[PDB]
Design a protein around this ligand. Structure first.
Ligand SMILES: [Zn+2]
Ligand SMILES: [Zn+2]
Ligand SMILES: [Zn+2]
Lengths: 48, 64, 511, 49, 48, 214, 102
RNA sequence: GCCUGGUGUCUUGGGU
DNA sequence: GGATTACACCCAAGACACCAGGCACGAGA
DNA sequence: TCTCGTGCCTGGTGTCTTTAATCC
């Protein structure tokens, strides 16, 4: 249970849009802004 | 064609979970439960609509 | 009174002494809005002070609670929170006063109210458009699907008016593809589609000849009878009630191993309640559900036989507007359960000390007060921790740029379909909008055609009890459902009251 | 200066103008790279040279 | 009003994909039309 | 000898069960109530024991002979995850589940509470009963400068200066020992009693600043 | 709640004052003590809550050496040790104290 | 006696 | 039976963690 | 003067069950 949780945190640190499992959440309730989400979409590093 | 399916049911005898395999032969309307652990076997009739939960239910009533 | 009592139990062996702890909620009382300073002093709050000092114009709510203590060897006015008051309503301190004294309270006589004040900011509730409950709608399905026609209904109770469940009846089989063209249904909390005949048998009506007598009321219609042919044969081997009910229970999302002796008794709940709960939920009334089920299948086949067009989803008679009243009740319902569980979780610790709890220490008014304030201030319709998936934009800051804009803003309606989904059907001005929503007033841009505005003479139904209507229908000749036979009644008219088939009358013209 | 304005300057063939807009007139930055491994891992003390 | 508001985004997407497909195509000094890989798209621009 | 009490194949099985975090003690309690209430009836709860280890968050362990008894113990318990998540423990793993597990005068500890939270302190002595320890601490004082404290609005650390106290605001008790504002300072250090549970004795990492000072 | 240092049982502290320890009070006499005595023989600090339902057939109970005691809540680890004067008095009674603090 | 930092993430309403 | 796609720019107003445990201070006996 | 209760601040840690079309 503890090793899988280290795998989990390292995964959602890089990509928090993994299909088929719940997103990592901030205490405010909104999803964590992972590095992958920083680069994609209209406002990310590349298009924005 | 026969269907060989693994299930997450607990064997009623050896109590090992996730070790019951269901073989449903619809051509002859014969369903077969098998235990991958203690090796027991149970046969029951199946229709066309049946699923591993249908014969596993019949196995619970066949014991009690 | 939706969940009127809380109940605990312990089988005292520590001389067994069952000690049920029970708490009953009684009458509600309301007080006029009051400002309580940090001092402790109180006074009547009027809106002008509330705007200036960024306060919330709200009324304290008190609830009678009653304790009782069963013991077998074998309170008063507790404060539950503050509810924001709509200005100029019957519970606002401005409703009286009279024109002379309005000027002294710095209130303008042209201000017609209809809005709330939350942290000094004026918030108006936007009417939410939804589909009607308890009505059957038939739609056609796209080509790459084995289904061609679907009947759908969302069932919702009359009391409260709240959603319960949703149910579908799908007709499989494409055009010359799909072989046996049978019909299966979808039931709440069951993982797989179940053929129609099986659920008919599972309700207590088992021989074929009675089943077809409940659906088709025209023995000559061989086209319709030919389409029900494969449904009989695919559910022939299920020849009695018991094996039918068990076939259901073996799919209904439960645990593995509840045996036939009980797996029936679990499925009987999924049939008695959750399946069509708007008709009835008391026992021994399964004749109404069986008759209604036959009506659905009849309507399904009329569309598949091209004798009736599919329903028009935009027909305004199939639509409802949720205004301030219904919207608050749904939110208050969610929050009152949250307050309830916090009381229940608190009793299990405070009774292990065996100390009489002072009640006022077991009601945290922050649950309702912060809940209502947060949702009205942000528009997020739900619990704060679940801000996504909840609907946004229900509350908006009241536009005060000009007088005309205030009138329009208080009469606005919203359809919550999205910006995802192009096409045109919810955006078009449909013919049935005539005289009910404005044909001209609509925003430019992304909301165009989805946000609408009530015509000048429109009104919204407040709601009325259906019970006096039933009494009037039976007094003037309506005959019960147990007396009805398609061979004898091959011509009479069916009567619906809020979507439940309640009777039949042979001479509708006088009625 | 969005994506569509970028395309217009390409069509004009004004390559020099486009470079300046997106660098000198904005967020131009100087970095040091290693000629061997190509990474920006250089530690550069400019007063000690 | 609905059509103008809807179909403006349809054609806006069309223009974006067209530009990215074609942005690197340049006339070179030998008259050929080539992309950034030096693939020949036309041996002579516009055939004239 | 403890070695004669090791488990064997004849002993009951032990299953672990996942429960809501922080609710492990509650579940153990609830299981005991159910067991005791059903003793001697026709349907006894056929578990022998249940327990929860702090080091093992979110788990309860239950001792029985049949898996069905585990399901019986947890039935209706609102703190237990409904998924059929119990797991079997091996006999060779049993005793480690029940392993029960410092502080010496003259050694260093780190304080866990109060204005001295995070500060390094020497253990001077412990109470006869064995609960609180007298600590030698670099004080964080103001000499009553703004009188008419928290860890976020405290003072810098500096040895007590009795002449500064004499000048500005004090009881002499012995050679180099003063009581100042009802605390004791000996040769510049505060000597103050702390609960042993209020100090950290393990894995202390001296800081740069502490290496400079001590 | 406190835990008896001798037997490990977990009870509300006042119980140790009212009734003594149900396992130990024949030798510990906490029922007839003052609070200082109760607090020297029972600890507010303990870890590893154990429901023992069947002392005499539980392996868990045998390992924790509570197999001869009464069904109840016990602690795997009890912090503190019995005062040397009480240990000496117990030994006069033929009772051997095996500390439960680890 | 030169240097000189004031937020973000959303949502909603608008303009062409 | 799965995601990815869904014009551009701009303006402005309107908002923000919860629960439990421990320690300290004040009041009452 | 001592003990108990209440309030405030700081630190640590989640969970009752409840929009639509395309290709690859
Ligand atoms: Zn087996
Ligand atoms: Zn390098
Ligand atoms: Zn004891």
């Amino acid at each position: 249970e503890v090793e899988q949780l280290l795998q989990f945190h390292v995964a959602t640190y890089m990509d928090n849009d993994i299909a088929g499992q719940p997103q990592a959440l901030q205490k405010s309730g909104r999803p964590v802004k992972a590095i992958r989400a920083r680069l994609k979409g209209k406002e990310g590093r590349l298009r924005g | 064609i026969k269907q060989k399916l693994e299930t997450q049911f607990t064997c009623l005898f050896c109590n090992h979970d996730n070790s019951v395999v269901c073989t449903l032969d619809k051509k002859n309307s014969i369903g077969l439960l098998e235990c991958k652990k203690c090796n027991l076997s149970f046969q029951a009739p199946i229709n066309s609509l049946s699923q591993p939960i249908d014969i596993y239910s019949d196995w619970i009533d066949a014991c009690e | 009174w939706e969940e009127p009592r809380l109940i605990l139990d312990q089988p005292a062996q520590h001389d067994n002494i069952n000690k049920r702890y029970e708490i009953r909620f009684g009458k509600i009382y309301l007080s006029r809005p009051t400002m309580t300073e940090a001092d402790g002093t109180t006074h009547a709050m009027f809106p002008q002070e509330a705007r200036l000092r960024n306060l919330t114009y709200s009324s304290p709510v008190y609830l009678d609670m009653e304790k009782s203590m069963f013991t077998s060897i074998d309170g008063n006015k507790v404060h539950i929170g503050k509810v924001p008051i709509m200005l100029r309503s019957k519970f606002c301190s401005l409703r009286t006063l009279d024109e002379v004294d309005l000027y002294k309270m710095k209130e303008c006589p042209y201000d017609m109210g209809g809005y709330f004040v939350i942290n000094g900011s004026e918030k108006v509730l936007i009417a939410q458009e939804r589909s009607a409950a308890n009505i059957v709608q038939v739609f056609k399905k796209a080509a790459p699907s084995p289904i061609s026609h679907v009947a759908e209904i969302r069932s919702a109770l009359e009391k409260g008016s709240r959603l319960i469940s949703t149910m579908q009846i799908k007709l499989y089989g494409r055009e010359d593809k799909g072989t046996g063209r049978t019909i299966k249904a979808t039931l709440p909390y069951v993982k797989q589609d179940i053929p129609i005949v099986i659920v008919f048998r599972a309700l207590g009506v088992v021989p074929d000849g009675e089943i077809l007598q409940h659906i088709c009321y025209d023995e000559n219609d061989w086209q319709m009878l030919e389409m029900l042919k494969p449904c009989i044969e695919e559910g022939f081997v299920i020849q009695d009630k018991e094996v039918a009910l068990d076939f259901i229970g073996r799919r209904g999302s439960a645990a593995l191993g509840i045996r036939r002796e009980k797996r029936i008794q679990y499925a009987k709940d999924i049939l008695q309640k959750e399946l069509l709960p708007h008709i009835t939920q008391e026992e021994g009334f399964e004749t109404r559900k069986t008759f209604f089920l036959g009506y659905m299948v009849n309507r399904l086949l009329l569309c598949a036989l091209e004798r009736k067009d599919q329903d028009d989803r935009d027909h305004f008679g199939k639509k409802r507007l949720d205004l301030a009243g219904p919207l608050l009740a749904n939110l208050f319902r969610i929050l009152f359960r949250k307050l309830t569980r916090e009381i229940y979780r608190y009793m299990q610790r405070c009774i292990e000390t065996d100390r009489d709890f002072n009640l006022n220490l077991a009601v945290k008014s922050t649950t309702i007060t912060s809940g209502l304030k947060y949702s009205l201030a942000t528009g997020n319709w739900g619990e704060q921790k679940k801000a996504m998936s909840s609907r946004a934009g229900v509350s908006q800051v009241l536009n005060r740029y000009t007088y005309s804009s205030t009138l329009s803003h208080l009469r606005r309606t919203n359809t919550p379909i999205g910006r995802d989904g192009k096409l045109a059907k919810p955006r078009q001005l449909h013919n049935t909008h005539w005289g009910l929503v404005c044909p001209a007033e609509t925003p430019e841009g992304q909301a165009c055609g989805l946000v609408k505005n009530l015509s000048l003479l429109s009104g919204i139904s407040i709601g009325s009890p259906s019970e006096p209507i039933i009494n009037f229908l039976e007094e003037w000749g309506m005959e019960p459902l147990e007396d009805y036979d398609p061979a004898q009644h091959t011509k009479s008219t069916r009567i619906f009251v809020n979507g439940v088939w309640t009777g039949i009358h042979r001479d509708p013209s006088m009625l | 200066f969005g994506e569509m304005e970028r395309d217009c300057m390409i069509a004009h063939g004004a390559a020099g103008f486009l470079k300046e807009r997106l660098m000198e007139a904005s967020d131009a930055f100087r970095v040091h790279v290693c000629g061997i491994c190509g990474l920006m891992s250089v530690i550069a003390n400019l007063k000690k040279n | 009003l609905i059509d103008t508001a809807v179909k403006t985004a349809e054609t806006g997407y069309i223009q974006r994909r067209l530009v990215k497909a074609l942005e690197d195509i340049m006339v070179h000094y030998d008259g050929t039309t080539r992309n950034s890989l030096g693939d020949i798209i036309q041996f002579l621009y516009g055939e004239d | 000898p403890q070695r004669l009490l090791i488990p064997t194949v004849d002993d009951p099985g032990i299953w672990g069960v996942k429960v809501r975090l922080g609710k492990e003690k509650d579940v153990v309690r609830q299981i005991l109530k159910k067991k005791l209430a059903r003793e001697g009836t026709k349907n006894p709860l056929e578990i022998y024991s249940a327990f929860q280890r702090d080091s093992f968050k979110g788990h309860v362990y239950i001792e029985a002979r049949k898996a069905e008894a585990i399901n019986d113990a947890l039935k209706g318990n609102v703190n237990v995850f409904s998924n059929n998540s119990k797991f079997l423990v091996g006999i060779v793993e049993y005793k480690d589940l029940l392993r029960p597990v410092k502080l010496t005068r003259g050694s260093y500890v780190r304080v866990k509470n109060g204005k001295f939270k995070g500060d390094l302190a020497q253990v001077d002595e412990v109470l006869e009963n064995g609960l609180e320890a007298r600590l030698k601490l670099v004080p964080r004082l103001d000499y009553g400068k703004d009188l008419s404290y928290t860890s976020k609005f405290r003072p810098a650390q500096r040895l007590f200066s009795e002449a500064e106290a004499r000048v500005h605001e004090i009881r002499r008790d012995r050679d180099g020992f003063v009581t100042y504002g009802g605390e004791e300072y000996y040769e510049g250090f505060l000597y103050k009693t702390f609960r042993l549970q209020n100090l950290i004795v393990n894995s202390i990492n001296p800081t740069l600043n502490e290496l400079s000072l001590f | 709640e406190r835990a008896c240092m001798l037997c490990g049982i977990v009870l509300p502290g006042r119980v140790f004052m009212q009734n003594g320890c149900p396992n130990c009070d024949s030798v510990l006499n906490l029922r007839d003590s003052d609070q200082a005595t109760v607090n020297e023989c029972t600890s507010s600090s303990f870890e590893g809550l154990v429901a023992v339902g069947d002392n005499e057939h539980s392996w868990v109970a045998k390992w924790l050496r509570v197999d001869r005691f009464q069904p109840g809540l016990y602690a795997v680890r009890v912090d503190g040790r019995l005062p040397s004067d009480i240990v000496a008095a117990l030994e006069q009674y033929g009772v051997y104290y095996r500390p439960r603090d680890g």
